[model samples]
Target chain A: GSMKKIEAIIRSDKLEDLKAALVQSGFIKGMTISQVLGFGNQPTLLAKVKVEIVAHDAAVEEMITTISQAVKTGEDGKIFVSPVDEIVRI
Target chain B: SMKKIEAIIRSDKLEDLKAALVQSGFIKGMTISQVLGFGNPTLLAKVKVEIVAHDAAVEEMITTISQAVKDGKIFVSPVDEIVRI
Candidate 1:
């Protein structure tokens, strides 16, 4: 069993594409989304759009990241994919 | 100085809200624990994500958070500053 760590910060308009990409990527039947405001901490003075996605321990890994990256492009967003410890749903 | 952005929302839509705010030129914030309080029957389980950001960011997010509401929405409050020690 493995966990997927997904983080996306992009344009507000990108929400639909972000969700659709995840759903199509087998992210999960249900995924969580949030509205966040951020000041880009980079030295270049670039601000970001943040979207964090935590998937249940599942077999699909690469697809989720790939699709997320595709949709999150052009808006200067970052998709950080890493390993997570555990995931629980209520 | 810091500000706390609190929201009473359905357990399911936290991520979308986070993404929306983050993309809107606000500072990166942290999300904290469960409220453990009761809510409408539609929300059997309720979890609150508290984000501490700059005051300006807090105001910017209030206008957008309602986007994540399903049958119910969230409330946003701003605290002057916080100490985690």
Candidate 2:
């Protein structure tokens, strides 16, 4: 099956809600959560949480929508979807 | 022609891997972050190293990473585009 990696940079405060939502959505395969610094339209760097999930193509939209709703803070965040060539378990 | 390489490795191995990547001249730019990996039953603390490299550099970068770390997973993904803002 084809897989895509979803990388979402969201507000630090919304992490727990997002995690709960993902678990509720049955996307508990695995994920990587990181504390990152993002610089976009803002002048100074902002503290953000980056969530990375690798899921099947069919689940991409659901994950995106779920993340979008969960991380809603009036200010929009960025979600990047990329194609995964391979996944290795080590 | 660019690919994103994501390496989820033991936190302790980060310094060695960083040095290897730098010595190998794969220093375009890299992002290192502390992450909780949820692959197993319990979440484990791991360091994630993310890099976007030209296609030609992929293999060498992987080799360098593998040599520097004893255990970890490396993922290669396609980048449709990368824009600087």
Candidate 3:
């Protein structure tokens, strides 16, 4: 099946809400969550949470929307979508 | 044909994996971070190692990681482009 990996970097406080929204949307295939430092167009580094999920191509848009809405705040977040050649279990 | 390799492995195995990669000369650049894997019924604490490498180097890198770690998941993704900021 065609798949795309979606990564979202958002504020730490929004992690729980984002998880809840994704679960409710039935994106329970699982995700990898990490704490990261974001250096964007800012002087100081921003502490953020990164959520990574590999979803079917068909579900990419819905997942993106779910993530954006879940993490929506006055501040902005970034979502990156990339193609996945394969997923291997080791 | 550049590719991105995202490996989610047991936290304790990080040092060994790092050593193996470094010894094998697979360390151009990598990002290591603590992560939680939601694949199980309960979240599992893991380490995420991300490396973007040329196509010619992918196989050896994967082999090095697989042999260094006991259990984990690896995802190979296509890279359209990589830009420096």
Candidate 4:
């Protein structure tokens, strides 16, 4: 429930690798992964895996950088990081 | 070698489908929210059902529920693309 939130749409199989990478960094408490249909104007006709991560504002930079580096190109995936005025988790 | 099947089914019947699949030894699958529109997540008017396993289960799955077509709807399609774990 903070401003520095990160959401990603990654290949379904990539979930384990992505999560392992996140956990090894020793920062993220946990993340939520959802099987989703992602249709974007990126010249890719596919439904890539989608993941969402929420953390504190200070954790934003590390999270984003790690994701960018860990991403695999063959997989049509995207990561979006933004500022959240308010988020409620219950 | 595995298969991932995607289907858009009515939310209510999804539970039954999962139950049937489990009974059939197909294990569990994934479900995501979907909308009828091109790209509308909030609408969440539809449910996307995804089953992934070896090819052996599809036929049994189809035949298992052939007689009991009670509620909702289901459409099965090839995974087309998967990165695998």
Candidate 5:
């Protein structure tokens, strides 16, 4: 399977709702998450939800659009996907 | 004063990379965790590998892994400071 990593930084408060949306859709295999401190355009620390996932190539676009919409509110959030060379299952 | 190496890779191939890194002394310690990735024909289980070390040392580790893994993405990010509590 083609591999890609998706990292999204969403509003702290919006995490629950967005997570529920993905869970219901059944697109998530699992996620690596952390409460990250970052600064965007305003240049100050913003408490944000960082959700990172590695997914197959087929679901990349639909998943990106779907998750982006779920978290789109008040400056929205950031989402990025990068190519991954492999996925070795243990 | 430190750098971080973040790699998203196949879950099954993780240990191979770890053993290689350990042999080379690139790993001080790392965070290994599960993550879902988007791409290809189907959804798959993946592992997230995080390593933190001196800037120069981190760069070498990245090179080592990049050469070792046939397929996987590796990148470096800066850490403002690394503190021990």
Candidate 6:
């Protein structure tokens, strides 16, 4: 099936809350998280958590909205959604 | 104008890839970490290398990395904007 990779860069401190919310909200399958340095309108790069989740086309919007609200802080965090041509198991 | 290239390769090859890139100077800046994923080899523990560079250098950098890596996936994504601070 086709999917979208939802990548969100959020404040490092919000990582736990967001992850828990996602788990409680049914995004319990899999995701990739990395500590990253994000440069936005801010004068300096900020320490953040980059979370990557590949979801079916239908679930993309809801997940994005969920995480966006879960971790947002003064416009510093951001989410990027990219389409994946396909997904294969194993 | 900038492009971001992300590669998910075997976890063990992380240092080899980094050394190769450093040797060739194919990297200006990067962020890397252990990641979990599936592929020809399912449930693989992989290393994700993310590089951000000028548009002109992206393709060559990707080629450089492609040669350095023994296997896995690599892709380019557009960077809407870049700010150095």
Instruction: Compare candidates 3 and 6 on TM-score and give the better one.
Output: 3
Q: What is the lDDT of residue A8 in candidate 5?
A: 93
lDDT digits (tens) for residues B21-75 of candidate 4? 6676654455445433222222223456566645776666556444323523445
Stretches off by above 4 angstroms in model 5 are A40-42, B1-85
Candidate 6 overall lDDT versus native: 0.73
List TM-scores for all candidates, in order.
Answer: 0.38, 0.49, 0.49, 0.44, 0.49, 0.48
For candidate 6, give the DockQ.
0.03
lDDT digits (tens) for residues B3-34 of candidate 5? 88899875545556666677787656677665
Residue B41 CA displacement from its true place in model 4, Å: 31
Per-residue error for A78 in candidate 5, Å, reads 1.0
- As a whole number from 0 to 100, the lDDT of residue B85 in candidate 3 is 68
Q: How many backbone clashes does candidate 4 have?
A: 0
Docking class of 6: incorrect
DockQ (CA atoms), all models: 0.04, 0.05, 0.05, 0.06, 0.02, 0.03
Residue A56, candidate 6: how far off, in angstroms? 0.6
For model 5, what is the error of residue B23's alpha carbon versus the real structure, in angstroms, after optimal superposition? 52
Give the lDDT of residue A40 in candidate 6. 37
Error of 4 at B36 (Å): 24
- Local accuracy of candidate 1 as per-residue lDDT tens digits, A1-90: 677766666644455555556666666354555555444433122222355666645643565565457555554555567778887767
Candidate 4 — which residues are off by over 4 angstroms? A39-45, A87-90, B1-85
Tens digit of per-residue lDDT, candidate 2, span B12-70: 56667767777887755788887766543444456788999888989988898999887
RMSD of 4: 15.2
Global lDDT of each candidate: 0.54, 0.79, 0.79, 0.58, 0.72, 0.73
Q: Write the per-residue lDDT of candidate 4 for residues A1-90, one digit (tens) a residue.
A: 467668887654454556667878985465766556544342222344566777787888888777766668664467788777887779
**Alpha-carbon lDDT of model 1:** 0.54
For this target, which candidate reaches the highest DockQ against the unseen true structure?
4
